[PDB]
Amino acid sequence: RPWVRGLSSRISIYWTIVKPGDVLVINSNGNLIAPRGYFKMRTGKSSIMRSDAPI
Amino acid sequence: GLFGAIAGFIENGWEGMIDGWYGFRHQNSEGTGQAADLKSTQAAIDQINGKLNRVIEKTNEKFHQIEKEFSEVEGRIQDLEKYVEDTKIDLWSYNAELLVALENQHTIDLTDSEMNKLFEKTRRQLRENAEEMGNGCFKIYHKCDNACIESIRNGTYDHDVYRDEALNNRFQI
Ligand SMILES: *[C@@H]1O[C@H](CO)[C@@H](O[C@@H]2O[C@H](CO)[C@@H](O[C@@H]3O[C@H](CO)[C@@H](O)[C@H](O)[C@@H]3O)[C@H](O)[C@H]2NC(C)=O)[C@H](O)[C@H]1NC(C)=O
Ligand SMILES: *[C@@H]1O[C@H](CO)[C@@H](O)[C@H](O)[C@H]1NC(C)=O
């Protein structure tokens, strides 16, 4: 790949949502870029906006 | 508008009447005066403020939606995403346009209506004691000082009390 911050290798990010009572099972023989825990999910009025406007 | 009073049989409006929307101007023996009619003036106002509230009512209130600006070209999904927003804006832009044109037409007719109602009512009070000069003014065929005008304005004018006097002057003196 083109040099990007020295490197020419990359990392592809993926995600998995685990519903309560289900189990996650990581299974590999190399190249894994393992997790360190989970992020909590909340349903609500949140969102995101692109803007260089002052706050 | 639909009625003919405003910008119709009433030649023009009174730049000077700053105390009401609709009003009276008389000329009797004692002189000349002017007075706003608070009752019809408030009927027009109430109705107009009534649509005003309906219109500028309670806001959209949306949170997380879909993206509307794109930095990269992607095709199919992006095409549909943009079309969805575009056809939406278009439908809301029509609604706004039409809504404002309907309301405006109605506000005019309605205010033309309250003028014409003030006229018929005042006309129905005078009974046979007056004639309409065709310009929104009634020719009162009897002596009518200020307290007489006031009673017309405040709705208490009794026509019998001046009928014969009226009738006499009216019908060939
Ligand atoms: C496959 O071809 C690419 C494309 O030419 C090769 O990438 C190039 O690798 C060199 C390192 O040998 C990169 O050099 C570095 O350039 C930076 C930027 O000026 C400089 O700071 C470093 O001193 C170094 O010279 C070069 O940038 C990079 N080119 C591109 C376009 O990314 C790649 O090495 C080839 N790989 C194989 C296995 O043949
Ligand atoms: C109407 O006019 C007469 C003359 O000024 C007065 O006596 C009468 O009480 C008035 N009515 C009202 C409601 O103002």
Side-chain angles (χ1 to χ4, degrees), chain B residues 61-98:
Chain B
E61 185 149 77
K62 307 314 214 179
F63 295 117
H64 185 58
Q65 302 170 64
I66 66 165
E67 304 289 328
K68 314 190 177 183
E69 283 167 29
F70 307 84
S71 53
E72 244 87 48
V73 137
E74 324 178 50
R76 183 158 199 186
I77 318 287
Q78 168 164 136
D79 277 358
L80 175 61
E81 281 169 331
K82 296 182 179 169
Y83 188 74
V84 159
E85 187 71 357
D86 195 59
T87 83
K88 173 163 111 149
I89 299 195
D90 274 14
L91 290 183
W92 271 116
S93 288
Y94 171 93
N95 287 12
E97 199 78 86
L98 187 79

Side-chain angles (χ1 to χ4, degrees), chain B residues 39-162:
Chain B
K39 200 138 185 306
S40 66
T41 283
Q42 193 55 66
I45 300 172
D46 284 345
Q47 293 178 76
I48 287 197
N49 286 5
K51 48 173 60 188
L52 208 46
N53 290 183
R54 223 220 334 145
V55 172
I56 67 173
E57 221 200 290
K58 260 302 135 267
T59 256
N60 231 165
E61 185 149 77
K62 307 314 214 179
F63 295 117
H64 185 58
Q65 302 170 64
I66 66 165
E67 304 289 328
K68 314 190 177 183
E69 283 167 29
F70 307 84
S71 53
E72 244 87 48
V73 137
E74 324 178 50
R76 183 158 199 186
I77 318 287
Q78 168 164 136
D79 277 358
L80 175 61
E81 281 169 331
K82 296 182 179 169
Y83 188 74
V84 159
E85 187 71 357
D86 195 59
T87 83
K88 173 163 111 149
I89 299 195
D90 274 14
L91 290 183
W92 271 116
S93 288
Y94 171 93
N95 287 12
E97 199 78 86
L98 187 79
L99 172 77
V100 158
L102 287 192
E103 299 295 312
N104 289 359
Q105 187 83 1
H106 180 245
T107 290
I108 284 164
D109 290 346
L110 159 178
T111 52
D112 187 27
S113 178
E114 296 298 324
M115 177 72 281
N116 191 72
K117 282 198 281 176
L118 188 48
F119 187 94
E120 289 298 277
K121 176 175 68 192
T122 293
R123 154 193 145 286
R124 280 171 169 121
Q125 239 184 318
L126 299 182
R127 272 300 257 296
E128 293 300 321
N129 312 359
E131 287 187 0
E132 147 148 48
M133 281 147 73
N135 57 355
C137 305
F138 296 95
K139 193 183 185 189
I140 300 180
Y141 290 97
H142 72 68
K143 303 180 174 206
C144 193
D145 71 308
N146 294 354
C148 166
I149 296 294
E150 170 48 31
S151 57
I152 295 179
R153 297 197 322 224
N154 78 64
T156 54
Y157 168 107
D158 188 335
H159 72 120
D160 286 310
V161 174
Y162 311 71

